[PDB]
Structure formats: structure tokens, C-alpha cells
Amino acid sequence: MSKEPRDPDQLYSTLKSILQQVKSHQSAWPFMEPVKRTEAPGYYEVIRFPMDLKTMSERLKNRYYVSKKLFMADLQRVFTNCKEYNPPESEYYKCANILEKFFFSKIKEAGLIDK
């Protein structure tokens, strides 16, 4: 099934649907939770709050992320922040690329990238 409403309140269920569709991708595995202190190279020094697909969703549970620039910056924050402290590894920058591209395709279902 796909989500594609056209209202403010209905957007909560669509932005979250895009979350379930983005986290379900084969590249959201590095964004399905909050980084760590011993596993993360150093997100506490360059990426304080990247808002992966788990924290941004926790806020989207109500209305924290539902205003075009709010849902976009949140996801773009996951991809951007993740790539920022991630050199040309191999699947890290790729997945964020992929998933990000998958998000945009899902955004148009909500109408957030629209003008």
C-alpha cells in the first residue's frame, strides 16, 4: 500500500509512512537508531543530533515533524549529518544517497517538496 493524503492532520500519517518506507529500505540500517559513543567514530563532536529514523519518528508521532521544511530538514539531517562525518567508505555514503533518493520519491507522496 502507499500513503498519499492531502491535509495537515493527514500529513502525520504520511510523514510517518515515508518513515516506515525509508527505514524499510535496504540502506536505512545505519539510521534505524541513535549512534553510540564507542561505535560512532565521534558523532558527539560533529553530529550532536542527526535525528536518525528512530528519533525523528518519535517526534513525528505527534506534530514535531510536519511542515514541509520540518520533515525535509529532519530527513536531510539524517543523510547530511551521516555523510558529513563519514568519508568515502563504500556503503555508508551510498545508503544515505540511496535512502535519501528513496525519501524524495516518498516525499512527493506527501507534497512536502512541492512549492
Swiss-Prot record:
Segments forming domain Bromo: 6-110
Effect upon mutating residue 35 to A: Reduced acetyl-lysine binding
Expressing tissues: Ubiquitously expressed but most abundant in heart and skeletal muscle. Also expressed in the skin, in keratinocytes (at protein level).
Cellular location(s): Nucleus; Cytoplasm, Cytoskeleton, Microtubule organizing center, Centrosome; Cytoplasm
UniProt disease annotation: Defects in KAT2B has been found in a patient with isolated coloboma, a defect of the eye characterized by the absence of ocular structures due to abnormal morphogenesis of the optic cup and stalk, and the fusion of the fetal fissure (optic fissure). Isolated colobomas may be associated with an abnormally small eye (microphthalmia) or small cornea.
Domain notes: (Microbial infection) The bromodomain mediates binding to HIV-1 Tat.
Family recorded in the similarity comment: Belongs to the acetyltransferase family. GCN5 subfamily.
Physiological role: Functions as a histone acetyltransferase (HAT) to promote transcriptional activation. Has significant histone acetyltransferase activity with core histones (H3 and H4), and also with nucleosome core particles. Has a a strong preference for acetylation of H3 at 'Lys-9' (H3K9ac). Also acetylates non-histone proteins, such as ACLY, MAPRE1/EB1, PLK4, RRP9/U3-55K and TBX5. Inhibits cell-cycle progression and counteracts the mitogenic activity of the adenoviral oncoprotein E1A.
Assembly and oligomerization: Interacts with SIRT1. Interacts (unsumoylated form) with NR2C1; the interaction promotes transactivation activity. Interacts with EP300, CREBBP and DDX17. Interacts with NCOA1 and NCOA3. Component of a large chromatin remodeling complex, at least composed of MYSM1, KAT2B/PCAF, RBM10 and KIF11/TRIP5. Interacts with NR2C2 (hypophosphorylated and unsumoylated form); the interaction promotes the transactivation activity of NR2C2. Interacts with KLF1; the interaction does not acetylate KLF1 and there is no enhancement of its transactivational activity. Interacts with NFE4. Interacts with MECOM.
Stated name of the protein: Histone acetyltransferase KAT2B
Part of the whole protein covered: 719 to 832 of 832
